[PDB]
Amino acid sequence: TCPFYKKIPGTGFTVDAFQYGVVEGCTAYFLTHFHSDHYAGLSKHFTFPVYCSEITGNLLKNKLHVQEQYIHPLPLDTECIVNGVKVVLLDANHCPGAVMILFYLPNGTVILHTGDFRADPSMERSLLADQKVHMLYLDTTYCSPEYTFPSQQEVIRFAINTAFEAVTLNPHALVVCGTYSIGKEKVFLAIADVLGSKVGMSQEKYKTLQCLNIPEINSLITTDMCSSLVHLLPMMQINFKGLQSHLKKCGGKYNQILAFRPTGWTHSNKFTRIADVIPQTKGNISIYGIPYSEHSSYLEMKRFVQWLKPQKIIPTVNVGTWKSRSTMEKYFREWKLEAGY
């Protein structure tokens, strides 16, 4: 049945709760972003109101074929009324169109649901600065101290430099980047830019990217693989077998592949620095795994919460085991005792 952490008390609202059929007493279903664990259940046959960002509404329409009459897009950073309740959507620093939602309850309670986010100090100067938050529904994906990773800027630096070097040494090398969902577009766009190429991809992926309001996008992407020296492929094809097969398809235009697998966190983050990462190699193929995260590190999460000083925290990730739950509750207590709220 719908879990309690997907219901907003004092309203007929749910968040990211599309796989439980009709939720008894829900008058509006909010969708924070277009990732499949979040939208799971939505289809062309859904007949309840969906509230979301403009970009998310472009994807629901074009990729899922949800009918237009049920899609309610809202602008960001704007006080809006939904079934009699004031709401604000804020940028989540996750994937394109990902939002956090502020609900202002009739009784005076204020609730923030982060959706999926990567906390940033820039958030401390949004509409959040303006008033108190009583309850926080938090993206706890990486809520443990061992989860460190570099900034997005440092990871892109490493990728740009690595690709630029390889292709300058061998102009017959192809660069390939793995994808399976929206998000992490900076990886393949930054690399294409340093190489003066457009990025080539399948028609289905091109379509997806045309929904995202990325400026000058037509100058940056294409469906003509031949004209482009950066190719996107399904993440599942980013292995030696899949890459050889793909090189075969390029008709002797290239004699080397350098590939990037953007992951979240991996255990090598505990020991190794970004400067020191090395690829997996077999023959004329090299695969780099790069830790490009669109979720809060442990420290970034802690800073955000200690700044906000909520009265109650409700985790939305890793809630399935008692040991996880107990571990998170310990950190919330440390944070609260350290900062004095």
Give CA–CA dist 283/121, Å, rounded: 44
Tokens of 191: 């690399």
Residue among 122, 139, 180, 176 nearest 284 (CA): 176
Stretch that binds Ni ion, among 11-19, 115-123, 266-274, 310-318 (CB under 5 A): 115-123
Nearer to Ni ion, 35 or 246 (CB): 35
Nearer to Ni ion, 116 or 185 (CB): 116
Q: How many residues does the chain have?
A: 341
Nearer to Ni ion, 264 or 279 (CB): 264
Q: Which residues are within 8 A (CB) of 228 and not within 5 positions of it... i.e. 6 or more apart?
A: 192, 197, 198, 199, 200, 222
DSSP-assigned states of every residue in 187-218: HHHHHHHHTT-PEE--HHHHHHHHTS--TTGG
**In the complex, least distance from residue 42 CB atom to Ni ion, rounded to whole angstroms:** 15
**In the complex, least distance from residue 227 CB atom to Ni ion, rounded to whole angstroms:** 32
The reply on whether position 116 binds Ni ion by CB under 5 A is: yes
Per CB under 5 A, contacts with Ni ion among 23-82 are: 35
**In the complex, least distance from residue 96 CB atom to Ni ion, rounded to whole angstroms:** 11
**In the complex, least distance from residue 174 CB atom to Ni ion, rounded to whole angstroms:** 29
**In the complex, least distance from residue 10 CB atom to Ni ion, rounded to whole angstroms:** 26
Point out the residue whose Cβ comes nearest to Ni ion: 116
Element (H, E) at 287: strand 285-291
Nearer to Ni ion, 35 or 205 (CB): 35
Nearer to Ni ion, 119 or 247 (CB): 119
∠238-215-122 over CA atoms, to 5°?
85
Stretch that binds Ni ion, among 112-120, 158-166, 242-250, 302-310 (CB under 5 A): 112-120
Stretch that binds Ni ion, among 42-50, 51-59, 109-117, 212-220 (CB under 5 A): 109-117
Nearer to Ni ion, 35 or 198 (CB): 35
Stretch that binds Ni ion, among 17-25, 110-118, 194-202, 265-273 (CB under 5 A): 110-118
**In the complex, least distance from residue 115 CB atom to Ni ion, rounded to whole angstroms:** 8
Q: Which residues are within 8 A (CB) of 116 and not within 5 positions of it... i.e. 6 or more apart?
A: 32, 33, 35, 38, 92, 94, 95, 98, 139, 141, 294, 295
Site map 158..187 versus Ni ion, x via CB under 5 A = ------------------------------
Local structure of 12: helix, strand or coil: coil
Separate counts of helices (H) and strands (E) for the chain? 8, 18
Number of CB atoms found within 10 A of residue 141's CB: 21
Nearer to Ni ion, 118 or 246 (CB): 118
**In the complex, least distance from residue 266 CB atom to Ni ion, rounded to whole angstroms:** 18
Stretch that binds Ni ion, among 116-124, 220-228, 240-248, 320-328 (CB under 5 A): 116-124
Element (H, E) at 101: strand 99-104
Local structure of 232: helix, strand or coil: strand
Nearer to Ni ion, 50 or 167 (CB): 50
Give CA–CA dist 14/93, Å, rounded: 22
Number of CB atoms found within 10 A of residue 81's CB: 9
Determine the size of the site formed for Ni ion (CB under 5 A). 2
Cα dist. 180→28, 167, 257 in Å?
29, 25, 20
**In the complex, least distance from residue 203 CB atom to Ni ion, rounded to whole angstroms:** 24
Nearer to Ni ion, 30 or 254 (CB): 30
Binding stretches for Ni ion (CB under 5 A): 35, 116
